[PDB]
Amino acid sequence: KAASGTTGTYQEWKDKAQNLYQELLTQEGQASFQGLKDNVFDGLVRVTQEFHMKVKHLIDSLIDFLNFTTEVLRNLQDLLQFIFQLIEDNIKQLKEMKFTYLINYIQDEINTIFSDYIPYVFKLLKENLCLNLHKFNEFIQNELQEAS
């Protein structure tokens, strides 16, 4: 009974293992993460806009609270709004220039290099060895002639 149950459970779970293998292949392809980056950038933009509104409201309320300085506070409000706009622009840029591409690029580069460039380097070493040996022979022949 124990053996039967164990075999049944293993065969049951074999399928999800292959599903996870497919998911891993997709991840190595780097094709399921960019969406999360876009979502987080959108959330960041939304939160930045909300905080922009809250901060300007706070400054406006503070002016009246103090009156219950003014020009400086208004200029500070304008500058803070400018900084908020800069932050929003930077977030939009970061969303535009996502980093997901270079990971797959380097993965492909290493996969190609291992199977392509390494044998060529070995061949370079072999050729250099033979060439240096032959040059050694030439130079020793010349030196021996001079010694004789």
């Binding site: 053996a3 039967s4 164990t6 075999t7």
Partner: protein, 48 residues
């Protein structure tokens, strides 16, 4: 394959496991019979 191998191994073990006990129980009984027979002639051997 592993499950089948394990099942056949345990099946092979079980028969010999039973066989040993089956062999030993009958001799266990025959020993009691022999001892009971022995007790009968103790007094006569002693006296003789």
């Amino acid at each position: 394959e592993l499950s089948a191998t394990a099942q056949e191994i345990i099946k092979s073990q079980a028969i010999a496991t039973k066989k040993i006990i089956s062999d030993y129980h009958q001799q266990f009984r025959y020993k009691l019979q022999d001892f009971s027979d022995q007790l009968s002639d103790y007094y006569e051997k002693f006296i003789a």
